[PDB]
Assembly symmetry: D2
Homo-oligomer: 97 residues x 4
Amino acid sequence: ETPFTVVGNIITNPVRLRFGDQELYKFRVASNSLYVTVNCWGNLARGVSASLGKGDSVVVVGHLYTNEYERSSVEVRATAVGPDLSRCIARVEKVQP
Amino acid sequence: FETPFTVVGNIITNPVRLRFGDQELYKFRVASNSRRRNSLYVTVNCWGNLARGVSASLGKGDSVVVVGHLYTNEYSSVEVRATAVGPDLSRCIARVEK
Amino acid sequence: FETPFTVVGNIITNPVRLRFGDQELYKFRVASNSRRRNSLYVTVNCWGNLARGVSASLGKGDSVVVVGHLYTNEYSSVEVRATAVGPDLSRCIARVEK
Amino acid sequence: ETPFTVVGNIITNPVRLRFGDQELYKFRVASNSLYVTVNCWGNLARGVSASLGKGDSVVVVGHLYTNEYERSSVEVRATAVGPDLSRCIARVEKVQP
Ligand SMILES: [Ca+2]
Ligand SMILES: [Ca+2]
């Protein structure tokens, strides 16, 4: 419940990870400096893996949090991600349910 | 000291293009996808390269992520000067071209 | 999926209290401190403990930080359901009591 | 130019630091989880040192960035800070220029 928006560029090769039913798509974003790891789940992990990659210019919206581990780092739980249409063009396709 | 703003929702009008010598405006109305089991309507203004990307890529009904700065115009209407707009990839797919 | 919002500026009206059985509303208008060498006007609504803190602490002219969620009401007016409000300590001092 | 807002509590004893003409007032904030270091400068460092302390409930607005050093961590360059009047009361005093 700390909302957060970052506009920038994916700077790593995203990675998919599975947890049975569920899917995570993870990547790093740089802003224009801020470096943050973005985590997409579900249908968002889908849209993003199908559409974006390293070097793409991106708009990320979600919630910011700290993740402690064996250091502690700052990450986004994304709720919406899109390509930044100031820097590119997109063909949009809906996914039949 | 501008007021930053983000809205996620859907374009709900047919966007309107306007040219001013060099410059281009593309503007449209956005409704936010709030849920109860509370709505937000705003006019978004895209300029420049952003106007171009958006007119080539999005239209009435499409899901959107809009980032920019919020303004009131007493002319009184609440408007966003967008800095980045994209389709919402939680609700769609995009084939990206530069 | 509410739309979060933050505005920093000044209260520019005398706030208005309204009671509804248990509940209290304190509402007022805010202008944002934008600079040129572009304004934003919004109605802010505080409820509950926030209505109490704000009525005890702030009034017309005071500098404010407002955090909450943004709404349009077609009744059409743009309003904030505030979650946290405070004086802007870049422009003032506050002696805090709980 | 990545804007950011956090509402929470100061959880360390703030510290003042000087650089000649200029003053920094630094403290840690927790949200309701996110931990972030907040940096106030100038008149903001003033208002905040004069008004707040460990345990106070706070509204922080500014810009988020990453700071690299001998690790890298996420910090806020605050532009406005106030006590959260949902959790307290305040007497406001203007500072004659
Ligand atoms: Ca990949
Ligand atoms: Ca101290």
